[PDB]
């Protein structure tokens, strides 16, 4: 009988009726998103908490798609038992597939997706990702990063679709895939998150969580446009950045968050903080009442925290009681959060859609991922060695990234940082090479040992190991490590033609060596379907990818970006094909 329980009522009328019935404590609870390790289902319900997230690597046991759905439903049952029965919204980083879930499809990271120049493909990946997430019940992915990465030293360069605002703006089609045209319209609708607002790709030195020291014009012309496009597509959520703009923390920027994002850009959705982001406002651990006040009054609606939910609620209650946070600010945050819960259909269909569990890691989704692997490959040098024949002559394969699911997936794969090894279901690049050259003997040695002049070609799959966020900052350099250079030198010493394949999250500093390589193929972080690399190597896919970042002649040029007058090794948009 309460109007908010009427599923035929317009959403704003349902929101009005529910909020009319809420105590201040109910409203404070809705503004909390707590990490699952800090609060089980009962505690989430006891505090009337609005949201739970899994941080990177935060899986139930066992890590299976069914166990995630069970975990989600367990939290939801408790939330539904409260006096108002406001359903929980659950968030997760599903940033290249449902990447915390073992056996989920792992798509190329954003930088390779930007290299495809194919927004329709990115949209299809958003839709397939949303299906695999909705199978586990989770309602909300912290994706896409619409960050415009301007300094390759940044540990999140690979989460960026490219260095040009055009790149990221075009790829906000990921939002349309994840959400559908209308949030909640289909059962696999999953709320998307434009992140991180704003300027995370512009920090000085590419330092993660750093300071973006640029004019308002530069901020608006380079970093803002992808947010505008995501909003035009109906993005349900925007996540604020840890970084600063001209020394002002984004999480305290009333101007950028309230005045520009909510006001000028007219964003009507849910503004969420980054993880324990208010804690970092004063540079000291934990959050103070001052940090709560500053960030709530900046206009943020929901606060993502690793623990201390009861302390957050107590602090915010006191701020509201004292009038330092106006009552309308709490109501604005609740109207935005509850609206998305109603739009997502959570008051009608709160539980995991287990009919979708068979799609998780399904062949059709892996075929889509393989197509993204193919199109993300960027051919940068080729003297004729590529494409390799399927003629039967012996091939040699080497490199620490040749036969490693985890290395080819990079960060945010099962764990937060990612890791090396066979960490989820997929096909390695070496396995794709063996299958492409199905009539050929294929010798593999990580370090190139055993290669000789009897081989018709040697393939060295080198580059980075997995990282995420600040752990991936590289102020010290981006050259190949000593193993990669030793292995390539061993292969070149055989006199055999050498194909170098970079598995990396960004351009690497290779200008001093590249002239010795018969071919160079940039593969980025292709994900679980490594066979798409062999598709290009053997000419099944004539390379179509183009560089989404300008490729340095020297580490000393960073930051290097299209139009800055510097002379690059390869310019933005560069990519060879077979001719
Ligand atoms: O892109 C930011 C991401 O959403 C982050 O907030 C994660 O949720 C957290 O780091 C998980 O450990
Ligand atoms: Mg599907
Ligand atoms: Mg759901
Ligand atoms: Mg750093
Ligand atoms: Mg603090
Ligand atoms: Mg495998
Ligand atoms: Mg650049």
Q: Is 49 exposed, middle or buried (0-12, 13-18, 19+ CB in 10 A)?
A: buried
Helix/strand/coil for 437: coil
E strand intervals along 122-255: 140-141, 193-197, 211-212, 237-240, 244-245, 248-249
Q: Is the peptide bond before 559 cis (omega within 30 degrees of 0)?
A: yes
- Specify the ligand 1 atom closest to the Cα of 274: 6
Count H helices and E strands in the chain, helices first. Answer: 19, 17
Ligand approaching nearest to the C-alpha of 426: 6
- Joined tokens for residue 247: 């020394």
Q: CA 168 to CA 10: how far, in whole Å?
A: 34
Whether residue 431 has its Cβ less than 6 Å from ligand 1: no
- Joined tokens for residue 121: 């493909």
Ligand approaching nearest to the C-alpha of 141: 1
Considering only the C-alpha atoms of the chain, give the largest distance between any 2 of them, rounded to a whole number of Å: 82
Q: H-type helices in 96-192, by residue range? A: 110-116, 119-134, 165-170, 173-179
Q: Are 483 and 447 in contact (CB under 8 A)?
A: yes
Strands of the sheet with 244-245, listed across from one edge: 211-212, 244-245, 248-249
Residues 533 and 490 placed together within one structural domain of the fold: yes
> Cα–Cα distances in Å, from 374 out to 152, 357, 530, 550?
23, 26, 9, 20
Angle at 537 between CA 504 and CA 123, to 5 degrees: 60
The structure tokens 């930088």 sit at: 111
**Among this protein's residues, is 274 annotated catalytic?**
yes
Question: 278 CA to middle of ligand 5, Å?
Answer: 7
Hey, which of 92, 93, 307 would you mutate to test ligand 1's pocket, going by the most ligand atoms within 8 Å of its Cβ?
Answer: 93
Please tell me which residue in 301, 375, 403, 469 is annotated as part of the active site: 469
Residues 340 and 434 placed together within one structural domain of the fold: no
Please tell me which residue in 274, 276, 404, 529 is annotated as part of the active site: 274
Backbone conformation region of residue 299, classed left if phi is above 0, alpha if psi is from -120 to 50, else beta: left
> Cα–Cα distances in Å, from 477 out to 156, 420, 512?
15, 22, 14
Question: 313 CA to middle of ligand 2, Å?
Answer: 40
Residues 233 and 111 placed together within one structural domain of the fold: yes
- Specify the ligand 1 atom closest to the Cα of 196: 1
* End position of a domain, from candidates 314, 338, 361: 361
Residues 272 and 369 placed together within one structural domain of the fold: no
Task: Pick out the residues of the known binding site for D-sorbitol.
Answer: 56, 93, 156, 195, 274, 469
> Cα–Cα distances in Å, from 290 out to 240, 255, 324, 448?
18, 18, 10, 58
Hey, which of 157, 275, 276 would you mutate to test ligand 1's pocket, going by the most ligand atoms within 8 Å of its Cβ?
Answer: 275
Residues 194 and 327 placed together within one structural domain of the fold: yes
- Specify the ligand 1 atom closest to the Cα of 193: 4
Whether residue 197 has its Cβ less than 6 Å from ligand 1: no
Residue-number span of the structural domain to which 136 is assigned: 1-361
Helix (H) or strand (E) holding 378: strand 378-382
* End position of a domain, from candidates 344, 361, 378: 361
**350-388 burial code (b ≥16 CB/10 A, e <16):** bebbbebbebbbbeebbebbbbbbbbbbbbbbbeebbbb
Residues 381 and 262 placed together within one structural domain of the fold: no
Residues 100 and 45 placed together within one structural domain of the fold: yes
Can you give the resolution of this entry in Å? 1.8
Q: CA 204 to CA 152: how far, in whole Å?
A: 11
**Among this protein's residues, is 391 annotated catalytic?**
no
Residues 324 and 461 placed together within one structural domain of the fold: no
Residues 339 and 435 placed together within one structural domain of the fold: no
Which CATH number fits the domain that encloses residue 138? 3.20.20.300
For the chain, how many structural domains are there in total? 2
Nearest to 188 by CA among 198, 180, 196: 180
Ligand approaching nearest to the C-alpha of 347: 3
* End position of a domain, from candidates 361, 383, 415: 361
Q: What is the 3-state secondary structure (H, E, C) of 106-131?
A: CCCCHHHHHHHCCHHHHHHHHHHHHH
Residues 205 and 302 placed together within one structural domain of the fold: yes
Residues 425 and 355 placed together within one structural domain of the fold: no
Residues 376 and 237 placed together within one structural domain of the fold: no
- Joined tokens for residue 189: 């609708």
Task: List 444's β-bridge partners, or say none.
Answer: 397
Q: CA 527 to CA 428: how far, in whole Å?
A: 9
- Specify the ligand 1 atom closest to the Cα of 57: 12
Whether residue 195 has its Cβ less than 6 Å from ligand 1: yes
Helix/strand/coil for 444: strand
Q: CA 394 to CA 84: how far, in whole Å?
A: 69
The structure tokens 């989704």 sit at: 365
Q: CA 165 to CA 163: how far, in whole Å?
A: 7
Strands of the sheet with 89-92, listed across from one edge: 140-141, 89-92, 51-54, 32-35, 303-305
Whose C-alpha lies nearest to ligand 1, atom 2?
Answer: 274
Q: CA 95 to CA 55: how far, in whole Å?
A: 12
Q: Are 530 and 426 in contact (CB under 8 A)?
A: yes
Task: List 500's β-bridge partners, or say none.
Answer: 460, 520
Sequence-distant (6+) residues with CB within 8 A of 264 are none
Q: CA 249 to CA 272: how far, in whole Å?
A: 15
The structure tokens 């490959």 sit at: 377
Task: Pick out the residues of the known binding site for Mg(2+).
Answer: 131, 137, 139, 163, 207, 279, 282, 284, 286, 291, 365, 426, 473, 560-561
């Amino acid at each position: 009988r309460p109007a908010y329980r009427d599923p035929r009522l317009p959403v704003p009328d349902r929101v009005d009726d529910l909020m009319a019935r809420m105590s201040l404590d109910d409203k404070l609870g809705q503004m909390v998103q707590v990490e699952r390790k800090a609060a089980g289902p009962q505690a989430v319900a006891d505090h009337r908490i609005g949201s739970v997230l899994s941080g990177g690597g935060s899986a139930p046991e066992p890590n299976t798609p069914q166990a995630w759905a069970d975990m989600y439903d367990s939290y939801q049952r408790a939330a539904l038992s409260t006096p108002l029965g406001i359903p929980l919204i659950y968030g997760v980083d599903a940033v290249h597939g449902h990447n915390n879930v073992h056996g989920a499809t792992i798509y190329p990271h954003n930088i390779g997706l930007g290299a495809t120049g194919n927004p329709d493909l990115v949209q299809r990946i958003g839709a397939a990702t949303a299906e695999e997430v909705a199978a586990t019940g989770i309602d909300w992915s912290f994706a896409p990063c619409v960050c415009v990465a301007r300094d390759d030293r940044w540990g999140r360069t690979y989460e960026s679709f490219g260095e040009k605002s055009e790149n990221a703006s075009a790829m906000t089609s990921a939002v349309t895939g994840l959400q559908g045209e209308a949030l909640g319209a289909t059962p696999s609708s999953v709320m998307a998150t434009a992140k991180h607002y704003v300027g995370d790709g512009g920090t000085t030195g590419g330092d993660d969580q750093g300071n973006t020291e640029i004019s308002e014009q530069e901020l608006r012309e380079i970093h803002l446009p992808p947010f505008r496009e995501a909003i035009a597509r109906g993005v349900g959520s925007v996540m604020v950045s840890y970084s600063s703009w001209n020394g002002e923390k984004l999480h305290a920027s009333t101007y950028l968050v309230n005045d520009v994002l909510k006001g000028e850009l007219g964003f009507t959705g849910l503004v969420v903080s980054d993880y324990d982001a208010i804690d970092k406002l004063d540079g000291q651990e934990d959050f103070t009442p001052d940090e709560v006040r500053a960030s709530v009054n900046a206009g943020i609606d929901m606060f993502m925290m690793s623990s201390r939910h009861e302390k957050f609620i107590d602090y915010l209650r006191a701020e509201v009681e004292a009038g330092r946070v106006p009552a309308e600010r709490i109501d604005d945050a609740n109207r935005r959060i509850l609206t998305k819960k109603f739009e997502l259909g959570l008051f009608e269909r709160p539980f995991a859609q287990r009919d979708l569990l068979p799609t998780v890691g399904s062949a059709e989704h892996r075929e889509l991922a393989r197509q993204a692997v193919r199109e993300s490959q960027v051919l940068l040098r080729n003297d004729g060695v590529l494409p390799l024949a399927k003629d039967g002559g012996k091939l040699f394969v080497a490199g620490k990234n040749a036969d490693d699911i985890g290395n080819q997936s990079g960060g945010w794969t099962i764990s937060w940082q990612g890791s090396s090894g066979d960490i989820t279901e997929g096909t390695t690049i070496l396995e794709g090479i063996r299958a492409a050259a199905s009539g050929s003997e294929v010798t593999y040695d990580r370090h190139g040992n055993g290669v000789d002049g009897s081989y018709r070609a040697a393939i060295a799959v080198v580059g980075e190991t997995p990282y995420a966020e600040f752990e991936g900052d590289r102020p010290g350099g981006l050259g190949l490590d000593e193993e990669d250079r030793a292995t390539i030198a061993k292969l070149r010493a055989s006199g055999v033609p050498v194909v170098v394949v970079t598995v990396s999250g960004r351009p690497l500093d290779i200008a001093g060596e590249v002239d010795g390589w018969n071919a160079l193929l940039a593969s980025w972080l292709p994900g679980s379907e490594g066979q798409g690399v062999a598709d290009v190597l053997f000419g099944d896919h004539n390379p179509t990818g183009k560089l989404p970042m300008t490729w340095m002649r020297s580490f000393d040029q960073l930051p290097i970006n299209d139009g800055d007058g510097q002379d690059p090794l390869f310019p933005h948009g560069f990519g060879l094909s077979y001719g």
